[PDB]
Design an enzyme around this catalytic site. Structure first.
Site, PDB file in Angstrom:
ATOM      1  N   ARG A 117       0.840  -1.189   0.000  1.00 55.64           N
ATOM      2  CA  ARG A 117       0.000   0.000   0.000  1.00 55.64           C
ATOM      3  C   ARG A 117       0.877   1.241   0.000  1.00 55.64           C
ATOM      4  O   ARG A 117       1.840   1.326   0.769  1.00 55.64           O
ATOM      5  CB  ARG A 117      -0.934   0.020   1.213  1.00 55.64           C
ATOM      6  N   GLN A 142       3.125   1.125   3.370  1.00 53.67           N
ATOM      7  CA  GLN A 142       2.847  -0.130   4.055  1.00 53.67           C
ATOM      8  C   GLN A 142       3.266  -1.297   3.177  1.00 53.67           C
ATOM      9  O   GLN A 142       2.979  -1.311   1.976  1.00 53.67           O
ATOM     10  CB  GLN A 142       1.362  -0.240   4.410  1.00 53.67           C
ATOM     11  N   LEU A 166      -5.199   6.732  13.063  1.00 55.23           N
ATOM     12  CA  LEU A 166      -5.043   5.319  13.368  1.00 55.23           C
ATOM     13  C   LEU A 166      -4.412   5.086  14.730  1.00 55.23           C
ATOM     14  O   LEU A 166      -4.231   3.927  15.120  1.00 55.23           O
ATOM     15  CB  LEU A 166      -4.205   4.633  12.287  1.00 55.23           C
ATOM     16  N   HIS A 179      -3.781   1.395  15.950  1.00 51.94           N
ATOM     17  CA  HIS A 179      -2.477   0.813  15.672  1.00 51.94           C
ATOM     18  C   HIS A 179      -1.531   1.141  16.819  1.00 51.94           C
ATOM     19  O   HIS A 179      -1.429   2.298  17.243  1.00 51.94           O
ATOM     20  CB  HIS A 179      -1.902   1.337  14.351  1.00 51.94           C
ATOM     21  N   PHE A 232       1.143  10.065   3.138  1.00 52.83           N
ATOM     22  CA  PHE A 232       0.424   9.680   4.342  1.00 52.83           C
ATOM     23  C   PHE A 232       1.027   8.423   4.953  1.00 52.83           C
ATOM     24  O   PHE A 232       1.417   8.424   6.123  1.00 52.83           O
ATOM     25  CB  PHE A 232      -1.059   9.466   4.037  1.00 52.83           C
ATOM     26  N   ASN A 276      -3.968  -3.314  11.684  1.00 56.70           N
ATOM     27  CA  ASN A 276      -4.938  -4.382  11.839  1.00 56.70           C
ATOM     28  C   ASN A 276      -6.198  -4.039  11.056  1.00 56.70           C
ATOM     29  O   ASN A 276      -6.596  -2.877  10.944  1.00 56.70           O
ATOM     30  CB  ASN A 276      -5.273  -4.620  13.316  1.00 56.70           C
ATOM     31  N   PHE A 307       3.581  -1.147   8.389  1.00 56.17           N
ATOM     32  CA  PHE A 307       3.288   0.173   7.858  1.00 56.17           C
ATOM     33  C   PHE A 307       4.362   1.145   8.316  1.00 56.17           C
ATOM     34  O   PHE A 307       4.898   1.029   9.419  1.00 56.17           O
ATOM     35  CB  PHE A 307       1.901   0.675   8.302  1.00 56.17           C
TER      36      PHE A 307
END
Lengths: 290, 55, 49, 34, 205, 299, 34, 320, 158
Positions: I47, I55, I114, I118, I52, I94, I105
């Site tokens: 990702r 990952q 997050l 996270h 931002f 998760n 990430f």
């Protein structure tokens, strides 16, 4: 000419009943943009509501990412001038006859190399849909669109067909209104749409957070807090958006005050937060404190 | 894409003769690096023909 | 983990069990997506089959 | 953009291909020959 | 350098130097910006400077610019270099075997003939028209989702019908429009031998 | 492979195998019955003719020699698979015959459900009706009991019913279905009966000399109905192991008896699946769908 | 007025190709006037 | 260096046929080996017996130089192609033209046939190639993208199926069904007028005044140069036995080994009696189907036939 | 066993992450033993959210793979004061809590959202200009970038 799977239009233009009925004619008429033959799909909009038809080449559509019938953008749904400017977008689409035909030809050639999922070009690298666009975006289906015209007979008296006047037998709009004569080609080119200038005046007069005078006013008053808030929650509202220096959660007046560590960070958090920083549902007011 | 009929037979023979020349050497046995004077080798060719015809 | 199928590939010739077909992907949703840019669409504005 | 103009010469004609038969010289006998 | 782990309390590093060799202090309540980190920057047009899987500067991207992974674009010297082959019995020197050949024959023949017959029916122009095929039923999943539009349903199933073409209808549109030819392709790279300038003697010869 | 079958003028409603599993029967609206080779390349040889309405049910014998077929045109019909030609026109049925069930390994007989309000027994030999239990309404599904001494039926009252062939009154009525009864199937145990219903809930019972008198054993979630109200049909495995269902979502539903988990909800289809056939020997499935074709999945 | 290619010149870059960009910072680059 | 090349015997002139009235520009052999066919710039198509060299028949339909002829393996058809922009389909059971493929816009420089399907490829000076359906005379595909005369075209059953060498000095390998260029080879410096495919080796060669080059299918990868023949190269033609004949435009014709790239023979014939010496030049070469005889079609209006020398050995002709 | 700065010398350039076992001992042990295990060789960045998040770390490369040192997954080691407030936040994400696996990430900017979903476990004490370069690159519609970027060498600090 082009060949389609189905049209591209907003929900308003698209309809309400679960089962939509539209008839197809291959190479039916000429996209006033691509200038060439297109397919024409004709959709029954609503009960006694004017049957619509696809009114632009599907490539002429994927170009600017707007509605092939409704003519407004497909994400927000404001005039294309607006939506473009709300992305700060600046398209170089050519205008003259030979220039436009050459442009359309190479455009279809370049779009042929696409996968049919999303508009081509800056239409993605401008996809930061600004809260300005989000806020100018209409909420519910303005389904007055599928009402008919002014039955010129029924405007003079003449519409002797009973109730079957093909057009809404109401009072005709005084064309002195700038919201009356917007040439379809100009509305597509983003060329002096008075409705778009109205959206500009509206999104200019619509409330946004105000700036103070001196740079050393780095205290920010957030009015309308309530007693479901925490200081760490005010933080998590304005914490990684920069650095905060302090926060006073006024419970004797139901407000707050963030003293910041970066002025532009304060600006980001507060101006983005104006009346819309909705954590646990309370309308706070972001301003620069005294 | 019009055919070659009876009135374009000589004109066409010359289109293609002088095309073939221009392919043939003045661009595939050069080494006159500059700008191979093909416009002038073609002028020789037409004067060689006039001189053949006049003996 | 065992055999799962690529959700973007729709031409898949092996007969997937429940989880071997619809196992959910790890991570967060892309906030950069207009609802249109999040939805699965075969066409520009919405999938048809 | 396919026109409706037309031609006397593009009328259907000679619509079957004569395939080279067994005795003439089929690609089979060419497969064999010395 | 960066204060120790467990001894990093109290200071907030704002200049990337207090990162030493780098690092963000997650427990330090600031946006950490060690080595250009954190900042969303100006959207500038340099396309992704990739690097090969050996660490080099893959200008194959600048060559294949705006082109699919189908294109073979020879621009490496290792293409210029003469390979050597000495085996009339290598795999390299062997054609596909006739099974693949008959497969590709059948596929070619098929797609060919369909496009043929469409271009041939073009020279029908009096189409002894066939009638309009069975009706289309298509399920449309809008990307617009919301309780208010489609009056609250997440799908619409749609009937397409083909509208009659009137037989006695002349052509509708001015087909013969002339424009210049579109821009060609991404130019190939000129993989030439080293070219020699001629003596002025030769030149005069 | 995928092995999608086609050739049908319309939706495919009824599909099953040879009780050998040698040749394949499918049919639907088209008022004829297509037959295939299951193996090889899935080849399509013969087509039975005649049945005026949509052939509402095909039903083999259990050996694989004779073919019964209840068609909406007021008639059931017997045919010789050896030929494909009709042995009997079981007429007399006053309205739309939906279901037919020939008794397996018992004397020659069929129990027939229809759109009249009767359950009818008929003999292959007499061209005569043996019995008729009028409950009050059209009979949609009928399956015997493995003694061929009770008749099981599913109709419009959600109240699954069973007649005593000898005492001729309503032997077993059991209830708990949330809406109309759409499919019955006796497992190879001879004992457990499987029932689908559009109400999103499918049920199992056990018809024995003794069952707890409230015999709703196992229940499965997922089956769908829609504004179509098409016919819904289900089966056990030949081993009584995997529960096979279709539905109007375009998902074929494969569960187990044991953990009742979703073993598969398989896509691939375009049409609503109107019948699933399990192979009497193989892990082979044919999904008859309203997309005017079939699938043959290997599992 | 009826000038079908006349204004292609004073109005727009007649038939436009945007210079393709490579590996460098082109956006903030711009130029002074006459 | 390389292994040592095979020793091939030499070839010796043994016949010289004279009946044409202008340059002889293309030559081809029947499938069954009874006759070959020449097309010349006196606008006739002559058909010669291959045993004796007697002329059986001469067909006259064209309006100008016939620049290429070919004969169908699958059907009793000869296909001719000319500078009058026309491509003709002679049917050999009446000896008559039955079919004509219209649509090019300048001389058609060459033409080839697909061995499996019935389609035709033709290359012309309007800088395009075209794929005709033999049977309905319709252009199914217009292979465009070169930028000058498309000097030559070859087609094969494997992939890619169509190779065109042009005068803008590049080669293109085309996808047929797609109908567009896969690979673009820009290794030559001067116009490419001859390309050839090995019968059993998934390889092909391409000649130009610079040097012949060998390449490997299907993505067109360099294999080796072949040099020595520094003259405008009009023809390349490869045997089954790794003989590669390269016939040039100033008369000279060299023979090579396909595999190692070693030029073992050099022939320089003499022009027919009344010719200038600048009227020596070779336009077409062809191996017979026994691959025993080699015919050549010359710029002095002759057909020179060379045969294999039966009384030479590695010790008569040492290999270098 | 807490490898202080774990090296993932990726194809475009190196990375090294310091994980605070005092803040996140369990996923710290996960990442230490995992990089030492080297099963990461061939992980394509699963990702890319430009500026931002970055990952990756899945043996599948689709988003539905990845397993831990403990089975499939383990719980989070959640912190009071550790946030994703800035770039280089190394936290395994998760799709539902107590299900943290192999995918990792690496942030590119303030990601305070997050946080609480996270467990922020440490930071990339090396390779952050490279992290900005990576978060610049062009990705397809599915955040598996058009560039097939993998790590060259995965290993601990000694």
């Amino acid at each position: 000419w082009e060949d389609a799977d189905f049209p591209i239009l907003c929900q308003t233009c698209l309809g309400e009943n679960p089962y939509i009925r539209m008839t197809k004619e291959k190479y039916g008429k000429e996209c006033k943009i691509c200038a060439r033959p297109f397919t024409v799909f004709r959709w029954c909009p609503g009960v006694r509501m004017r049957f619509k038809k696809t009114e632009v080449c599907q490539t002429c559509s994927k170009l600017k990412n707007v509605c092939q019938t409704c003519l407004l953008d497909l994400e927000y749904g404001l005039p294309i001038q607006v939506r473009d400017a709300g992305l700060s977008f600046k398209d170089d689409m050519p205008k003259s006859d030979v220039n436009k035909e050459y442009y359309t030809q190479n455009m279809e050639r370049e779009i042929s190399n696409s996968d049919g999922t999303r508009p081509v070009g800056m239409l993605g690298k401008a996809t930061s849909t600004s809260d300005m666009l989000l806020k100018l975006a209409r909420t519910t289906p303005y389904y007055k669109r599928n009402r008919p015209h002014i039955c010129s007979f029924w405007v003079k008296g003449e519409c002797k067909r009973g109730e079957e006047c093909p057009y809404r037998h109401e009072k005709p709009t005084d064309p002195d209104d700038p919201l009356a004569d917007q040439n379809i080609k100009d509305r597509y080119y983003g060329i002096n749409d008075p409705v778009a200038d109205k959206l500009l005046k509206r999104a200019s007069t619509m409330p946004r957070l105000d700036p103070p005078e001196d740079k050393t006013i780095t205290t920010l008053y957030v009015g309308g807090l309530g007693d479901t808030i925490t200081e760490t929650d005010l933080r998590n509202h304005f914490y990684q958006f920069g650095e905060i220096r302090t926060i006073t959660v006024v419970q004797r007046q139901q407000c707050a005050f963030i003293q910041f560590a970066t002025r532009q960070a304060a600006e980001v958090a507060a101006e983005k937060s104006f009346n819309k920083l909705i954590v646990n549902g309370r309308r706070l007011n972001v301003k620069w404190g005294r | 894409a019009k055919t070659v009929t009876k009135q374009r037979v000589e004109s066409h023979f010359d289109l293609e003769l002088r095309a073939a020349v221009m392919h043939d050497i003045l661009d595939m046995m050069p080494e006159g690096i500059k700008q191979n004077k093909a416009r002038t080798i073609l002028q020789h060719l037409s004067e060689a023909w006039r001189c053949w015809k006049a003996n | 983990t065992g055999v799962h199928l690529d959700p973007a590939v729709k031409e898949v010739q092996y007969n997937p069990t429940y989880e071997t077909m619809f196992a959910p992907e790890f991570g967060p949703e892309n906030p950069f997506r207009t609802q249109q840019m999040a939805a699965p669409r075969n066409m520009l504005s919405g999938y048809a089959e | 953009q396919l026109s409706k103009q037309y031609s006397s010469r593009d009328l259907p004609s000679h619509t079957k291909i004569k395939y080279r038969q067994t005795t003439q010289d089929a690609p089979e006998e060419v497969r064999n020959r010395d | 350098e960066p204060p120790p782990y467990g001894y990093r309390k109290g200071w907030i590093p704002r200049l990337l130097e207090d990162f030493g060799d780098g690092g963000a202090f997650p427990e330090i309540h600031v946006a950490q910006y060690p080595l250009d980190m954190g900042r969303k920057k100006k959207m500038s047009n340099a396309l992704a400077i990739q690097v090969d899987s050996e660490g080099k500067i893959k200008y194959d991207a600048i060559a294949r610019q705006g082109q699919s992974k189908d294109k073979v674009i020879y621009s490496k010297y290792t293409d210029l270099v003469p390979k050597e082959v000495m085996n009339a019995d290598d795999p390299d020197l062997q054609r596909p075997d006739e099974e693949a050949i008959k497969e590709i024959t059948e596929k070619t023949r098929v797609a060919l003939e369909k496009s043929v017959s469409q271009k041939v029916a073009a020279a029908m122009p009096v189409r002894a028209a066939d009638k309009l095929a069975p009706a289309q039923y298509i399920r449309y999943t809008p990307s617009q989702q919301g309780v208010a539009f489609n009056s609250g349903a997440k799908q619409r199933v749609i009937r397409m019908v083909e509208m009659q073409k009137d037989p006695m209808e002349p052509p509708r549109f001015k087909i013969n429009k002339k424009i210049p030819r579109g821009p060609p392709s991404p130019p190939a790279p000129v993989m030439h031998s080293p070219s020699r300038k001629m003596t002025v003697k030769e030149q005069q010869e | 492979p995928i092995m999608l079958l086609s050739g049908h003028e319309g939706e495919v409603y009824c599909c099953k195998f040879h009780p050998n599993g040698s040749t394949l029967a499918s049919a639907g609206f088209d008022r004829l019955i297509l037959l295939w080779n299951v193996y090889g390349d899935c080849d399509n040889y013969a087509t039975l003719k005649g049945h005026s309405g949509a052939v509402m049910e095909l039903h083999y014998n259990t050996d694989g020699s004779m073919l019964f077929s209840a068609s909406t045109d007021k008639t059931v019909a017997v045919w010789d698979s050896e030929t494909g030609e009709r042995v009997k026109r079981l007429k007399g049925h006053t309205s739309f015959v939906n279901s037919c069930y020939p008794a397996r390994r018992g004397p020659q007989l069929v129990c027939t459900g229809s759109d009249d309000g009767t359950v009818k027994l008929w003999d292959i030999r007499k061209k005569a009706a043996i019995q008729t239990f009028q409950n009050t309404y059209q009979v949609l599904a009928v399956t015997f009991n493995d003694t061929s001494d009770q008749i099981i039926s599913g109709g419009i009252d959600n109240d699954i019913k069973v007649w005593d062939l000898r005492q001729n009154k309503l032997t077993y009525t059991m209830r708990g279905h949330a809406d109309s009864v759409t499919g019955l199937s006796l497992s190879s145990e001879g004992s457990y009966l499987l029932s689908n219903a559009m109400d999103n809930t499918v049920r199992v019972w056990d018809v024995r000399p003794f069952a707890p008198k409230e015999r709703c054993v196992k229940i499965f979630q997922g089956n769908v109905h829609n504004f179509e109200k098409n016919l819904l049909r289900c089966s056990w495995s030949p081993d009584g192991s995997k529960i096979a269902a279709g539905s109007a979502d375009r998902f074929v539903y494969v569960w187990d008896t044991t953990s009742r988990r979703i073993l598969y909800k398989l896509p691939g289809h375009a049409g609503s699946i109107n019948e699933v056939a399990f192979h009497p020997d193989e892990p082979i499935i044919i999904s008859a769908s309203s997309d005017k074709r079939l699938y043959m999945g290997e599992i | 007025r009826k000038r079908k290619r006349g204004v292609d010149y004073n109005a727009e870059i007649p038939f436009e190709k945007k210079p393709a960009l490579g590996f460098y910072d082109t956006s903030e680059e711009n130029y002074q006037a006459l | 260096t390389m292994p040592k090349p095979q020793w091939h015997p030499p070839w010796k002139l043994y016949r010289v046929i004279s009946g044409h009235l202008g340059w002889v520009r293309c030559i081809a052999v029947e499938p069954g080996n009874q006759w070959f066919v020449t097309g010349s710039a006196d606008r006739t198509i002559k058909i010669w017996d291959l045993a004796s060299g007697k002329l059986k028949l001469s067909l006259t339909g064209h309006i100008s130089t016939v620049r290429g002829v070919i004969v169908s393996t699958r059907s009793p058809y000869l296909f001719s192609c000319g500078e009058d922009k026309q491509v003709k389909c002679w049917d050999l059971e009446y000896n008559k033209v039955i079919r004509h493929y219209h649509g090019h816009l300048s001389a058609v420089y060459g033409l080839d046939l697909h061995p499996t399907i019935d389609v035709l490829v033709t290359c012309s000076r309007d800088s395009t190639a075209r794929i005709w359906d033999v049977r309905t005379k319709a252009s199914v595909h217009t292979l465009s993208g070169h930028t000058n005369a498309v000097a030559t075209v070859r087609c094969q059953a494997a992939e890619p199926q169509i190779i065109t060498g042009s005068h803008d000095t590049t080669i293109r390998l085309w996808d047929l069904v797609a109908g567009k260029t896969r690979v673009t080879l820009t290794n030559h410096k001067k116009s490419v007028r001859a390309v050839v495919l090995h019968p059993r080796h998934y390889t092909f060669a391409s000649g130009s005044p610079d040097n012949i080059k060998q390449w490997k299918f299907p993505d067109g990868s360099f294999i080796q140069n072949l040099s020595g023949h520094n003259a405008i190269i009009n023809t390349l033609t490869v045997n089954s036995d790794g003989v590669l004949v390269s016939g040039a435009d100033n008369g000279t014709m060299h023979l090579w080994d396909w595999r190692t790239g070693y030029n073992f023979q050099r022939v320089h014939a003499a022009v027919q009696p009344g010719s200038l010496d600048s009227e020596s030049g070779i336009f077409a070469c062809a191996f017979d189907q026994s691959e025993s005889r080699l015919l050549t079609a010359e710029a002095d209006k002759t057909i020179k036939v060379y045969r294999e020398d039966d009384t030479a050995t590695e010790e008569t002709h040492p290999v270098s | 066993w807490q490898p202080p700065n774990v090296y993932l010398e990726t194809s475009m350039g190196i990375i090294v992450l310091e994980l605070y076992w005092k803040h996140a001992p369990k996923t710290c042990k996960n990442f230490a033993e995992l990089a030492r295990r080297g099963y990461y060789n061939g992980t394509k960045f699963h990702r890319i959210i430009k500026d931002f998040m970055i990952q990756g770390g899945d043996p599948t490369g689709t988003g539905r793979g990845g397993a831990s040192i403990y089975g499939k997954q383990f719980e989070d080691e959640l912190h009071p004061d550790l946030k994703f407030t800035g770039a280089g936040i190394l936290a395994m994400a998760n799709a539902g809590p107590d299900t943290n696996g192999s995918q990792f990430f690496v942030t590119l900017a303030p990601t305070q959202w997050l946080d609480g979903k996270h467990t922020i476990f440490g930071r990339v004490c090396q390779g952050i200009g490279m992290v900005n370069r990576v978060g610049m690159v062009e990705t397809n519609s599915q955040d598996r970038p058009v560039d097939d970027v993998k790590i060259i060498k995965a290993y601990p600090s000694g």
